[PDB]
Amino acid sequence: ASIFRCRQCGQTISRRDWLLPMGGDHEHVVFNPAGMIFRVWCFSLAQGLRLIGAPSGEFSWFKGYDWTIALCGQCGSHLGWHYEGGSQPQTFFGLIKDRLAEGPA
Ligand SMILES: O=C1CC[C@H](N2C(=O)c3ccccc3C2=O)C(=O)N1
Ligand SMILES: [Zn+2]
């Protein structure tokens, strides 16, 4: 139980070791404007994604941060968001926990 892969395809995405307490917890439960609930795990680092477009501050769940959609770079599944433009840290990834699979390295 050390690496996180895309649930839909198996692409390598992140690692347990890279979880990031933001505001004291790596886990944040949030809703978007369409009411969808997301159980977001914050990671300092991730790979295997494709970050789409340019950042936006609109509706940001994390104060001082702008976001880009993060798709699985292999299959296109929406795995979460990349956050930037903030402070301590400047950047991080917020990934949707139930869209990843955890397993051995
Ligand atoms: O921090 C974030 C990331 C993006 C997220 N978001 C969405 O999930 C979404 C769906 C549809 C229209 C607009 C949005 C939006 O801003 C959101 O609500 N906040
Ligand atoms: Zn995938």
Helix or strand (DSSP H, E) at 75 = none
Chain centroid, CA 75 distance in Å: 16
CB 14 within 8 A of CB 4: yes
Q: Are the CB atoms for 75 and 56 separated by under 8 Å?
A: no
Which ligand 1 atom minimizes the distance to the CA of 83? 1
Query: What contacts 23, CB < 8 A, 6 or more positions away?
Result: none
51-to-22, 24, 65 alpha-carbon distances in Å: 21, 26, 15
Topology of domain 1-105 in CATH is: 2.170.150
Sign for the pseudo-dihedral over CA of 3, 54, 65, 81 = negative
Q: Is 58 in the pocket of ligand 1 (CB under 6 A)?
A: yes
Pairing of strands 12-15, 27-31: unpaired
Q: Does 68 contact ligand 1 (Cβ within 6 A)? A: no
59 ligand 1 Cβ < 6 A: yes
Q: Is 42 labelled a binding residue? A: no
Answer whether 77's CB lies under 8 Å from 69's CB. Answer: no
Q: Is the dihedral of CA 101, 47, 77, 91 positive or negative?
A: positive
